[PDB]
DNA sequence: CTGTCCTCTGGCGA
DNA sequence: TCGCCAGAGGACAGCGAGTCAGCAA
RNA sequence: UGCUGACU
């Protein structure tokens, strides 16, 4: 019954990850304890969640928990079919051992039609975003980046870079070309604000 | 690889830095006509940036691209069009290059 | 119009240097010198009286510039 | 002297 | 059946400033 | 130009 503890931690972390992306999540899911998780729900196909977005109610996300410890191209297709038929665009695949290396470039191959993304199970046992040293990241909107570049007379290159595989760019699901504001809690100035272009 | 790198260089010359990964993904999802349309669209809509291309983060990308090319794609290989075109140049100490039969 | 109103120390140094190199090349002194042979003392005397017709052209990192008057600049 | 960088280098399932 | 994770050694290139002298090739 | 000494 440690499998259940792992399932509960991963589900709580994914609920927090979905709330930080701006999806409609209730307080109970974010404050759900183990005794009630196991009360509700055992399997790995009824842990799949489907969440809606604050705006764009059609824009929803779908979280998978594949059974195969090493997901492959066929496993990816089997529920890319589910997504294509239910009419969703985004997904999130929590894998237990990894993805066979061809799969990673397949997930990338699926054009903005159906954009997927993978997360290891050991990466979700804790919320890195809740570490002391990790600042708060905020994906800037297309109209705030323009005002930033205009205030500092900048170009989008010539800005600090954040890797597209950064453990906190993968969590906040930030695509390439997006600028993220970062609020460092500084011992010197309190709440220093920086900006990083995702690339 | 030849055409991908050609287009990536064409876009780097003007500074466009997202075009690099965009071209690579356009390729993998798919050759010259597929890539040259996007690359010309970039180089046209993003010109006026030949003076704003001599910045760090634009030199690192070109450095990495050309280094990876010279490091991974210039090894002796059986020839594509004629299967027996490995006239193995193999250079001894400087001032010496030896082709075989 | 958006940069600091005061005169940085580097600007004071360069303005004094240039005014002194001008005075030394036989330029008219608008400060009524009183027996001093140093052009740098004369340049300081002029800076204190707010008589220096020079235009500090502050350059921003993208080429854009702002032209300030040495008179319209708070000397600390 | 010590470090990275560099250049290979043959070895099991897809 | 060899591509990429692993795995090996080989090569290069750096090694604080600034002074004064003599002797000799 | 190099090798020997030498100074902080």
């Amino acid at each position: 019954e440690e499998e259940t503890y792992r399932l509960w931690k991963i589900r709580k972390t994914i609920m927090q990850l979905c709330h930080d992306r701006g999806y409609l999540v209730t307080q109970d899911e974010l404050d759900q304890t183990l005794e009630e998780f196991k009360a509700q729900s055992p399997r790995r196909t009824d842990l799949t969640v489907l969440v809606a977005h604050n705006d764009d109610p059609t824009d929803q996300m779908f979280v998978f928990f594949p059974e195969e410890p090493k997901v492959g191209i066929k496993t990816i297709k089997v529920y890319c079919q589910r997504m294509q038929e239910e009419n969703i665009t985004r997904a999130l695949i929590v894998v237990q051992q990894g993805m066979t290396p061809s799969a990673k470039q397949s997930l990338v191959d699926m054009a903005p039609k159906y954009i997927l993304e993978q997360f290891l199970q050991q990466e979700l046992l804790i919320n890195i975003t809740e570490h002391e040293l990790v600042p708060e990241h905020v994906v800037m909107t297309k109209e705030e980046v323009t005002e930033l570049l205009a205030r500092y007379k900048l170009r989008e290159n010539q800005l600090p870079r954040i890797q597209a595989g950064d453990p906190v760019a993968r969590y906040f699901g930030i695509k390439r070309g997006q600028v993220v504001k970062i609020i460092r809690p500084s011992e010197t100035a309190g709440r220093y604000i920086t900006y990083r272009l995702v690339q | 690889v030849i055409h991908l790198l050609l287009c990536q260089l064409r876009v780097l010359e003007v500074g466009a830095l997202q075009a690099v990964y965009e071209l690579e993904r356009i390729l993998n999802r798919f050759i010259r006509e597929e890539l040259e349309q996007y690359t010309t669209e970039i180089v046209q809509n993003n010109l006026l940036g030949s003076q704003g291309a001599h910045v760090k983060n634009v030199c690192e990308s070109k450095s990495k691209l050309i280094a990876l090319f010279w490091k991974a794609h210039m090894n002796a290989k059986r020839c594509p069009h004629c299967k027996t075109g490995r006239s193995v140049v193999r250079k001894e100490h400087n001032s010496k290059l030896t082709i075989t039969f | 119009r958006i940069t600091t109103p005061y005169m940085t120390k580097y600007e004071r140094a360069r303005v004094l240097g240039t005014r002194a190199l001008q005075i030394a090349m036989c330029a008219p002194v608008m400060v009524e010198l009183e027996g001093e042979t140093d052009p740098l003392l004369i340049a300081m005397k002029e800076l204190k009286a707010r008589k220096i017709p020079i235009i500090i052209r502050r350059y921003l990192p993208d080429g854009s510039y702002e032209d300030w008057g040495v008179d319209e600049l708070i000397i600390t």
PDB file of all heavy atoms in Angstrom, chain D residues 1 4 8 11-14, chain E residues 1-4 7 11 14:
ATOM      1  O5'  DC D   1      52.490  19.692 -12.091  1.00  0.00           O
ATOM      2  C5'  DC D   1      51.775  18.501 -11.786  1.00  0.00           C
ATOM      3  C4'  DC D   1      50.421  18.824 -11.179  1.00  0.00           C
ATOM      4  O4'  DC D   1      49.748  19.803 -11.995  1.00  0.00           O
ATOM      5  C3'  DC D   1      49.451  17.666 -11.124  1.00  0.00           C
ATOM      6  O3'  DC D   1      48.442  17.947 -10.162  1.00  0.00           O
ATOM      7  C2'  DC D   1      48.893  17.656 -12.549  1.00  0.00           C
ATOM      8  C1'  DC D   1      48.899  19.144 -12.921  1.00  0.00           C
ATOM      9  N1   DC D   1      49.424  19.423 -14.287  1.00  0.00           N
ATOM     10  C2   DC D   1      49.033  20.588 -14.950  1.00  0.00           C
ATOM     11  O2   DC D   1      48.241  21.359 -14.396  1.00  0.00           O
ATOM     12  N3   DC D   1      49.530  20.837 -16.184  1.00  0.00           N
ATOM     13  C4   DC D   1      50.383  19.981 -16.749  1.00  0.00           C
ATOM     14  N4   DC D   1      50.848  20.270 -17.970  1.00  0.00           N
ATOM     15  C5   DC D   1      50.798  18.791 -16.087  1.00  0.00           C
ATOM     16  C6   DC D   1      50.301  18.556 -14.869  1.00  0.00           C
ATOM     17  P    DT D   4      36.230  18.664 -15.797  1.00  0.00           P
ATOM     18  OP1  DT D   4      34.927  18.787 -15.115  1.00  0.00           O
ATOM     19  OP2  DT D   4      36.829  17.327 -15.989  1.00  0.00           O
ATOM     20  O5'  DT D   4      36.129  19.365 -17.228  1.00  0.00           O
ATOM     21  C5'  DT D   4      36.051  20.782 -17.319  1.00  0.00           C
ATOM     22  C4'  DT D   4      36.371  21.243 -18.726  1.00  0.00           C
ATOM     23  O4'  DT D   4      37.692  20.775 -19.106  1.00  0.00           O
ATOM     24  C3'  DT D   4      35.405  20.735 -19.784  1.00  0.00           C
ATOM     25  O3'  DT D   4      35.018  21.790 -20.638  1.00  0.00           O
ATOM     26  C2'  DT D   4      36.190  19.655 -20.527  1.00  0.00           C
ATOM     27  C1'  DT D   4      37.640  20.076 -20.331  1.00  0.00           C
ATOM     28  N1   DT D   4      38.573  18.905 -20.242  1.00  0.00           N
ATOM     29  C2   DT D   4      39.618  18.777 -21.141  1.00  0.00           C
ATOM     30  O2   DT D   4      39.846  19.582 -22.025  1.00  0.00           O
ATOM     31  N3   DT D   4      40.397  17.656 -20.951  1.00  0.00           N
ATOM     32  C4   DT D   4      40.229  16.681 -19.983  1.00  0.00           C
ATOM     33  O4   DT D   4      40.969  15.711 -19.884  1.00  0.00           O
ATOM     34  C5   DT D   4      39.120  16.880 -19.089  1.00  0.00           C
ATOM     35  C7   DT D   4      38.844  15.885 -18.003  1.00  0.00           C
ATOM     36  C6   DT D   4      38.354  17.962 -19.264  1.00  0.00           C
ATOM     37  P    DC D   8      38.542  10.825 -35.196  1.00  0.00           P
ATOM     38  OP1  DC D   8      39.543   9.800 -35.570  1.00  0.00           O
ATOM     39  OP2  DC D   8      38.354  12.006 -36.068  1.00  0.00           O
ATOM     40  O5'  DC D   8      37.110  10.134 -34.990  1.00  0.00           O
ATOM     41  C5'  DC D   8      36.995   8.710 -34.894  1.00  0.00           C
ATOM     42  C4'  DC D   8      37.611   8.188 -33.606  1.00  0.00           C
ATOM     43  O4'  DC D   8      36.997   8.840 -32.462  1.00  0.00           O
ATOM     44  C3'  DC D   8      37.432   6.685 -33.369  1.00  0.00           C
ATOM     45  O3'  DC D   8      38.630   6.136 -32.832  1.00  0.00           O
ATOM     46  C2'  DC D   8      36.298   6.638 -32.349  1.00  0.00           C
ATOM     47  C1'  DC D   8      36.637   7.858 -31.521  1.00  0.00           C
ATOM     48  N1   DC D   8      35.517   8.375 -30.676  1.00  0.00           N
ATOM     49  C2   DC D   8      35.197   7.726 -29.477  1.00  0.00           C
ATOM     50  O2   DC D   8      35.832   6.717 -29.152  1.00  0.00           O
ATOM     51  N3   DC D   8      34.188   8.217 -28.713  1.00  0.00           N
ATOM     52  C4   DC D   8      33.526   9.310 -29.106  1.00  0.00           C
ATOM     53  N4   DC D   8      32.541   9.763 -28.324  1.00  0.00           N
ATOM     54  C5   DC D   8      33.846   9.988 -30.318  1.00  0.00           C
ATOM     55  C6   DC D   8      34.842   9.494 -31.062  1.00  0.00           C
ATOM     56  P    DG D  11      32.594  -5.772 -29.764  1.00  0.00           P
ATOM     57  OP1  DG D  11      33.457  -6.921 -30.115  1.00  0.00           O
ATOM     58  OP2  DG D  11      31.443  -5.435 -30.631  1.00  0.00           O
ATOM     59  O5'  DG D  11      32.031  -5.982 -28.278  1.00  0.00           O
ATOM     60  C5'  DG D  11      31.926  -4.870 -27.388  1.00  0.00           C
ATOM     61  C4'  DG D  11      30.502  -4.697 -26.881  1.00  0.00           C
ATOM     62  O4'  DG D  11      30.006  -3.391 -27.285  1.00  0.00           O
ATOM     63  C3'  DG D  11      29.486  -5.701 -27.426  1.00  0.00           C
ATOM     64  O3'  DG D  11      28.442  -5.917 -26.470  1.00  0.00           O
ATOM     65  C2'  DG D  11      28.960  -4.976 -28.651  1.00  0.00           C
ATOM     66  C1'  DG D  11      28.878  -3.555 -28.119  1.00  0.00           C
ATOM     67  N9   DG D  11      28.914  -2.546 -29.167  1.00  0.00           N
ATOM     68  C8   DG D  11      29.709  -2.542 -30.286  1.00  0.00           C
ATOM     69  N7   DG D  11      29.517  -1.508 -31.055  1.00  0.00           N
ATOM     70  C5   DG D  11      28.527  -0.783 -30.406  1.00  0.00           C
ATOM     71  C6   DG D  11      27.909   0.437 -30.763  1.00  0.00           C
ATOM     72  O6   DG D  11      28.119   1.144 -31.754  1.00  0.00           O
ATOM     73  N1   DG D  11      26.957   0.825 -29.825  1.00  0.00           N
ATOM     74  C2   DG D  11      26.642   0.125 -28.685  1.00  0.00           C
ATOM     75  N2   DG D  11      25.695   0.660 -27.900  1.00  0.00           N
ATOM     76  N3   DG D  11      27.215  -1.019 -28.339  1.00  0.00           N
ATOM     77  C4   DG D  11      28.146  -1.410 -29.243  1.00  0.00           C
ATOM     78  P    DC D  12      27.545  -7.251 -26.537  1.00  0.00           P
ATOM     79  OP1  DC D  12      28.059  -8.178 -25.504  1.00  0.00           O
ATOM     80  OP2  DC D  12      27.481  -7.689 -27.949  1.00  0.00           O
ATOM     81  O5'  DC D  12      26.073  -6.774 -26.119  1.00  0.00           O
ATOM     82  C5'  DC D  12      25.002  -7.720 -26.123  1.00  0.00           C
ATOM     83  C4'  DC D  12      23.668  -7.073 -25.775  1.00  0.00           C
ATOM     84  O4'  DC D  12      23.641  -5.704 -26.236  1.00  0.00           O
ATOM     85  C3'  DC D  12      22.465  -7.717 -26.433  1.00  0.00           C
ATOM     86  O3'  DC D  12      21.296  -7.433 -25.677  1.00  0.00           O
ATOM     87  C2'  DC D  12      22.445  -7.031 -27.803  1.00  0.00           C
ATOM     88  C1'  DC D  12      22.975  -5.627 -27.488  1.00  0.00           C
ATOM     89  N1   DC D  12      23.965  -5.112 -28.481  1.00  0.00           N
ATOM     90  C2   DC D  12      23.961  -3.755 -28.838  1.00  0.00           C
ATOM     91  O2   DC D  12      23.108  -3.000 -28.362  1.00  0.00           O
ATOM     92  N3   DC D  12      24.888  -3.309 -29.721  1.00  0.00           N
ATOM     93  C4   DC D  12      25.792  -4.154 -30.222  1.00  0.00           C
ATOM     94  N4   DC D  12      26.689  -3.672 -31.086  1.00  0.00           N
ATOM     95  C5   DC D  12      25.817  -5.530 -29.861  1.00  0.00           C
ATOM     96  C6   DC D  12      24.900  -5.960 -28.995  1.00  0.00           C
ATOM     97  P    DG D  13      19.911  -8.184 -25.997  1.00  0.00           P
ATOM     98  OP1  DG D  13      19.287  -8.570 -24.713  1.00  0.00           O
ATOM     99  OP2  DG D  13      20.186  -9.217 -27.020  1.00  0.00           O
ATOM    100  O5'  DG D  13      19.030  -7.041 -26.679  1.00  0.00           O
ATOM    101  C5'  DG D  13      17.614  -7.045 -26.565  1.00  0.00           C
ATOM    102  C4'  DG D  13      17.070  -5.689 -26.970  1.00  0.00           C
ATOM    103  O4'  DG D  13      18.089  -4.992 -27.716  1.00  0.00           O
ATOM    104  C3'  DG D  13      15.879  -5.723 -27.907  1.00  0.00           C
ATOM    105  O3'  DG D  13      15.204  -4.469 -27.875  1.00  0.00           O
ATOM    106  C2'  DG D  13      16.552  -5.956 -29.256  1.00  0.00           C
ATOM    107  C1'  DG D  13      17.865  -5.179 -29.104  1.00  0.00           C
ATOM    108  N9   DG D  13      19.019  -5.871 -29.677  1.00  0.00           N
ATOM    109  C8   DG D  13      19.313  -7.211 -29.595  1.00  0.00           C
ATOM    110  N7   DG D  13      20.410  -7.543 -30.221  1.00  0.00           N
ATOM    111  C5   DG D  13      20.872  -6.345 -30.749  1.00  0.00           C
ATOM    112  C6   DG D  13      22.025  -6.071 -31.524  1.00  0.00           C
ATOM    113  O6   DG D  13      22.901  -6.856 -31.913  1.00  0.00           O
ATOM    114  N1   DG D  13      22.114  -4.721 -31.848  1.00  0.00           N
ATOM    115  C2   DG D  13      21.206  -3.759 -31.473  1.00  0.00           C
ATOM    116  N2   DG D  13      21.457  -2.511 -31.880  1.00  0.00           N
ATOM    117  N3   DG D  13      20.126  -4.001 -30.749  1.00  0.00           N
ATOM    118  C4   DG D  13      20.024  -5.308 -30.423  1.00  0.00           C
ATOM    119  P    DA D  14      13.753  -4.311 -28.549  1.00  0.00           P
ATOM    120  OP1  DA D  14      12.921  -3.504 -27.628  1.00  0.00           O
ATOM    121  OP2  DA D  14      13.301  -5.660 -28.954  1.00  0.00           O
ATOM    122  O5'  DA D  14      14.030  -3.461 -29.879  1.00  0.00           O
ATOM    123  C5'  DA D  14      14.428  -2.091 -29.787  1.00  0.00           C
ATOM    124  C4'  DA D  14      14.567  -1.462 -31.166  1.00  0.00           C
ATOM    125  O4'  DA D  14      15.427  -2.284 -31.994  1.00  0.00           O
ATOM    126  C3'  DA D  14      13.267  -1.309 -31.947  1.00  0.00           C
ATOM    127  O3'  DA D  14      13.336  -0.161 -32.783  1.00  0.00           O
ATOM    128  C2'  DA D  14      13.216  -2.592 -32.767  1.00  0.00           C
ATOM    129  C1'  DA D  14      14.690  -2.830 -33.072  1.00  0.00           C
ATOM    130  N9   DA D  14      15.039  -4.243 -33.194  1.00  0.00           N
ATOM    131  C8   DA D  14      14.179  -5.305 -33.238  1.00  0.00           C
ATOM    132  N7   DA D  14      14.779  -6.467 -33.354  1.00  0.00           N
ATOM    133  C5   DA D  14      16.125  -6.143 -33.388  1.00  0.00           C
ATOM    134  C6   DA D  14      17.288  -6.929 -33.498  1.00  0.00           C
ATOM    135  N6   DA D  14      17.268  -8.261 -33.602  1.00  0.00           N
ATOM    136  N1   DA D  14      18.477  -6.287 -33.514  1.00  0.00           N
ATOM    137  C2   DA D  14      18.488  -4.955 -33.391  1.00  0.00           C
ATOM    138  N3   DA D  14      17.465  -4.112 -33.292  1.00  0.00           N
ATOM    139  C4   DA D  14      16.301  -4.776 -33.290  1.00  0.00           C
TER     140       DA D  14
ATOM    141  O5'  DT E   1      24.535  -7.374 -39.759  1.00  0.00           O
ATOM    142  C5'  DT E   1      23.384  -6.533 -39.718  1.00  0.00           C
ATOM    143  C4'  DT E   1      23.714  -5.193 -39.084  1.00  0.00           C
ATOM    144  O4'  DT E   1      22.673  -4.838 -38.152  1.00  0.00           O
ATOM    145  C3'  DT E   1      24.957  -5.186 -38.231  1.00  0.00           C
ATOM    146  O3'  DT E   1      25.340  -3.841 -37.968  1.00  0.00           O
ATOM    147  C2'  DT E   1      24.446  -5.878 -36.968  1.00  0.00           C
ATOM    148  C1'  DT E   1      23.016  -5.331 -36.864  1.00  0.00           C
ATOM    149  N1   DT E   1      21.999  -6.353 -36.493  1.00  0.00           N
ATOM    150  C2   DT E   1      20.720  -5.942 -36.225  1.00  0.00           C
ATOM    151  O2   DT E   1      20.383  -4.773 -36.238  1.00  0.00           O
ATOM    152  N3   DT E   1      19.849  -6.940 -35.897  1.00  0.00           N
ATOM    153  C4   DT E   1      20.116  -8.296 -35.855  1.00  0.00           C
ATOM    154  O4   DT E   1      19.258  -9.120 -35.560  1.00  0.00           O
ATOM    155  C5   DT E   1      21.477  -8.668 -36.161  1.00  0.00           C
ATOM    156  C7   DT E   1      21.889 -10.110 -36.135  1.00  0.00           C
ATOM    157  C6   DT E   1      22.344  -7.689 -36.467  1.00  0.00           C
ATOM    158  P    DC E   2      26.501  -3.139 -38.831  1.00  0.00           P
ATOM    159  OP1  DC E   2      26.159  -3.275 -40.264  1.00  0.00           O
ATOM    160  OP2  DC E   2      27.793  -3.657 -38.326  1.00  0.00           O
ATOM    161  O5'  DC E   2      26.415  -1.593 -38.420  1.00  0.00           O
ATOM    162  C5'  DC E   2      25.306  -0.787 -38.839  1.00  0.00           C
ATOM    163  C4'  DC E   2      24.715   0.010 -37.676  1.00  0.00           C
ATOM    164  O4'  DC E   2      24.173  -0.899 -36.686  1.00  0.00           O
ATOM    165  C3'  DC E   2      25.689   0.887 -36.900  1.00  0.00           C
ATOM    166  O3'  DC E   2      24.957   1.920 -36.228  1.00  0.00           O
ATOM    167  C2'  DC E   2      26.234  -0.114 -35.887  1.00  0.00           C
ATOM    168  C1'  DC E   2      24.935  -0.801 -35.493  1.00  0.00           C
ATOM    169  N1   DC E   2      25.085  -2.169 -34.937  1.00  0.00           N
ATOM    170  C2   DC E   2      24.069  -2.677 -34.133  1.00  0.00           C
ATOM    171  O2   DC E   2      23.090  -1.964 -33.894  1.00  0.00           O
ATOM    172  N3   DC E   2      24.184  -3.929 -33.633  1.00  0.00           N
ATOM    173  C4   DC E   2      25.258  -4.663 -33.916  1.00  0.00           C
ATOM    174  N4   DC E   2      25.322  -5.896 -33.400  1.00  0.00           N
ATOM    175  C5   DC E   2      26.313  -4.165 -34.745  1.00  0.00           C
ATOM    176  C6   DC E   2      26.183  -2.922 -35.232  1.00  0.00           C
ATOM    177  P    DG E   3      24.632   3.324 -36.943  1.00  0.00           P
ATOM    178  OP1  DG E   3      23.810   3.053 -38.143  1.00  0.00           O
ATOM    179  OP2  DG E   3      25.911   4.052 -37.083  1.00  0.00           O
ATOM    180  O5'  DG E   3      23.725   4.107 -35.870  1.00  0.00           O
ATOM    181  C5'  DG E   3      22.399   3.645 -35.576  1.00  0.00           C
ATOM    182  C4'  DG E   3      21.765   4.402 -34.404  1.00  0.00           C
ATOM    183  O4'  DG E   3      21.803   3.591 -33.211  1.00  0.00           O
ATOM    184  C3'  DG E   3      22.435   5.699 -33.998  1.00  0.00           C
ATOM    185  O3'  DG E   3      21.482   6.549 -33.358  1.00  0.00           O
ATOM    186  C2'  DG E   3      23.510   5.232 -33.016  1.00  0.00           C
ATOM    187  C1'  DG E   3      22.959   3.911 -32.460  1.00  0.00           C
ATOM    188  N9   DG E   3      23.893   2.807 -32.610  1.00  0.00           N
ATOM    189  C8   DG E   3      24.994   2.783 -33.424  1.00  0.00           C
ATOM    190  N7   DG E   3      25.646   1.662 -33.382  1.00  0.00           N
ATOM    191  C5   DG E   3      24.929   0.881 -32.488  1.00  0.00           C
ATOM    192  C6   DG E   3      25.167  -0.441 -32.050  1.00  0.00           C
ATOM    193  O6   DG E   3      26.087  -1.200 -32.383  1.00  0.00           O
ATOM    194  N1   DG E   3      24.207  -0.864 -31.138  1.00  0.00           N
ATOM    195  C2   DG E   3      23.146  -0.103 -30.700  1.00  0.00           C
ATOM    196  N2   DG E   3      22.325  -0.685 -29.811  1.00  0.00           N
ATOM    197  N3   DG E   3      22.910   1.144 -31.107  1.00  0.00           N
ATOM    198  C4   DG E   3      23.842   1.567 -32.000  1.00  0.00           C
ATOM    199  P    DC E   4      21.949   7.883 -32.589  1.00  0.00           P
ATOM    200  OP1  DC E   4      20.815   8.830 -32.634  1.00  0.00           O
ATOM    201  OP2  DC E   4      23.267   8.299 -33.121  1.00  0.00           O
ATOM    202  O5'  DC E   4      22.147   7.409 -31.072  1.00  0.00           O
ATOM    203  C5'  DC E   4      21.022   6.964 -30.315  1.00  0.00           C
ATOM    204  C4'  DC E   4      21.446   6.461 -28.943  1.00  0.00           C
ATOM    205  O4'  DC E   4      22.419   5.395 -29.096  1.00  0.00           O
ATOM    206  C3'  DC E   4      22.096   7.503 -28.037  1.00  0.00           C
ATOM    207  O3'  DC E   4      21.705   7.285 -26.687  1.00  0.00           O
ATOM    208  C2'  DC E   4      23.587   7.247 -28.236  1.00  0.00           C
ATOM    209  C1'  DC E   4      23.622   5.739 -28.440  1.00  0.00           C
ATOM    210  N1   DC E   4      24.759   5.283 -29.289  1.00  0.00           N
ATOM    211  C2   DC E   4      25.346   4.035 -29.052  1.00  0.00           C
ATOM    212  O2   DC E   4      24.917   3.330 -28.130  1.00  0.00           O
ATOM    213  N3   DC E   4      26.381   3.638 -29.834  1.00  0.00           N
ATOM    214  C4   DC E   4      26.819   4.430 -30.814  1.00  0.00           C
ATOM    215  N4   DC E   4      27.836   3.992 -31.563  1.00  0.00           N
ATOM    216  C5   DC E   4      26.230   5.701 -31.073  1.00  0.00           C
ATOM    217  C6   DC E   4      25.215   6.086 -30.291  1.00  0.00           C
ATOM    218  P    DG E   7      30.075   3.051 -17.584  1.00  0.00           P
ATOM    219  OP1  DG E   7      30.094   1.771 -16.843  1.00  0.00           O
ATOM    220  OP2  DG E   7      29.903   4.322 -16.846  1.00  0.00           O
ATOM    221  O5'  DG E   7      31.414   3.152 -18.451  1.00  0.00           O
ATOM    222  C5'  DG E   7      31.713   2.143 -19.407  1.00  0.00           C
ATOM    223  C4'  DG E   7      32.879   2.558 -20.285  1.00  0.00           C
ATOM    224  O4'  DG E   7      32.394   3.233 -21.460  1.00  0.00           O
ATOM    225  C3'  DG E   7      33.836   3.553 -19.656  1.00  0.00           C
ATOM    226  O3'  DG E   7      34.848   2.871 -18.919  1.00  0.00           O
ATOM    227  C2'  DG E   7      34.428   4.284 -20.868  1.00  0.00           C
ATOM    228  C1'  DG E   7      33.468   3.955 -22.017  1.00  0.00           C
ATOM    229  N9   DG E   7      32.953   5.143 -22.697  1.00  0.00           N
ATOM    230  C8   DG E   7      31.951   5.977 -22.261  1.00  0.00           C
ATOM    231  N7   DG E   7      31.709   6.967 -23.076  1.00  0.00           N
ATOM    232  C5   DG E   7      32.612   6.785 -24.115  1.00  0.00           C
ATOM    233  C6   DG E   7      32.819   7.550 -25.291  1.00  0.00           C
ATOM    234  O6   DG E   7      32.224   8.574 -25.653  1.00  0.00           O
ATOM    235  N1   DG E   7      33.836   7.019 -26.081  1.00  0.00           N
ATOM    236  C2   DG E   7      34.559   5.889 -25.776  1.00  0.00           C
ATOM    237  N2   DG E   7      35.503   5.526 -26.656  1.00  0.00           N
ATOM    238  N3   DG E   7      34.375   5.164 -24.678  1.00  0.00           N
ATOM    239  C4   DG E   7      33.390   5.670 -23.896  1.00  0.00           C
ATOM    240  P    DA E  11      48.755  12.132 -27.807  1.00  0.00           P
ATOM    241  OP1  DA E  11      49.462  12.070 -29.105  1.00  0.00           O
ATOM    242  OP2  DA E  11      49.516  11.966 -26.549  1.00  0.00           O
ATOM    243  O5'  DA E  11      47.953  13.509 -27.729  1.00  0.00           O
ATOM    244  C5'  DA E  11      46.810  13.711 -28.552  1.00  0.00           C
ATOM    245  C4'  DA E  11      46.528  15.192 -28.722  1.00  0.00           C
ATOM    246  O4'  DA E  11      45.425  15.586 -27.865  1.00  0.00           O
ATOM    247  C3'  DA E  11      47.686  16.107 -28.362  1.00  0.00           C
ATOM    248  O3'  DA E  11      47.688  17.241 -29.214  1.00  0.00           O
ATOM    249  C2'  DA E  11      47.399  16.477 -26.907  1.00  0.00           C
ATOM    250  C1'  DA E  11      45.874  16.446 -26.834  1.00  0.00           C
ATOM    251  N9   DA E  11      45.373  15.920 -25.567  1.00  0.00           N
ATOM    252  C8   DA E  11      45.808  14.794 -24.929  1.00  0.00           C
ATOM    253  N7   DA E  11      45.180  14.542 -23.810  1.00  0.00           N
ATOM    254  C5   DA E  11      44.262  15.570 -23.703  1.00  0.00           C
ATOM    255  C6   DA E  11      43.294  15.866 -22.729  1.00  0.00           C
ATOM    256  N6   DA E  11      43.099  15.113 -21.647  1.00  0.00           N
ATOM    257  N1   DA E  11      42.531  16.966 -22.911  1.00  0.00           N
ATOM    258  C2   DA E  11      42.735  17.717 -24.003  1.00  0.00           C
ATOM    259  N3   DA E  11      43.621  17.536 -24.992  1.00  0.00           N
ATOM    260  C4   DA E  11      44.360  16.431 -24.778  1.00  0.00           C
ATOM    261  P    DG E  14      47.876  28.938 -23.730  1.00  0.00           P
ATOM    262  OP1  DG E  14      47.575  30.243 -24.353  1.00  0.00           O
ATOM    263  OP2  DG E  14      49.186  28.306 -24.000  1.00  0.00           O
ATOM    264  O5'  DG E  14      47.681  29.081 -22.151  1.00  0.00           O
ATOM    265  C5'  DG E  14      46.453  29.581 -21.650  1.00  0.00           C
ATOM    266  C4'  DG E  14      46.398  29.504 -20.138  1.00  0.00           C
ATOM    267  O4'  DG E  14      46.001  28.174 -19.733  1.00  0.00           O
ATOM    268  C3'  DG E  14      47.711  29.784 -19.437  1.00  0.00           C
ATOM    269  O3'  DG E  14      47.796  31.168 -19.138  1.00  0.00           O
ATOM    270  C2'  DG E  14      47.605  28.940 -18.171  1.00  0.00           C
ATOM    271  C1'  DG E  14      46.781  27.744 -18.636  1.00  0.00           C
ATOM    272  N9   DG E  14      47.576  26.604 -19.068  1.00  0.00           N
ATOM    273  C8   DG E  14      48.268  26.483 -20.244  1.00  0.00           C
ATOM    274  N7   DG E  14      48.873  25.337 -20.375  1.00  0.00           N
ATOM    275  C5   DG E  14      48.558  24.653 -19.212  1.00  0.00           C
ATOM    276  C6   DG E  14      48.931  23.361 -18.790  1.00  0.00           C
ATOM    277  O6   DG E  14      49.638  22.534 -19.377  1.00  0.00           O
ATOM    278  N1   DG E  14      48.395  23.053 -17.546  1.00  0.00           N
ATOM    279  C2   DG E  14      47.601  23.889 -16.804  1.00  0.00           C
ATOM    280  N2   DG E  14      47.181  23.414 -15.623  1.00  0.00           N
ATOM    281  N3   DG E  14      47.243  25.104 -17.187  1.00  0.00           N
ATOM    282  C4   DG E  14      47.756  25.419 -18.398  1.00  0.00           C
TER     283       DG E  14
END
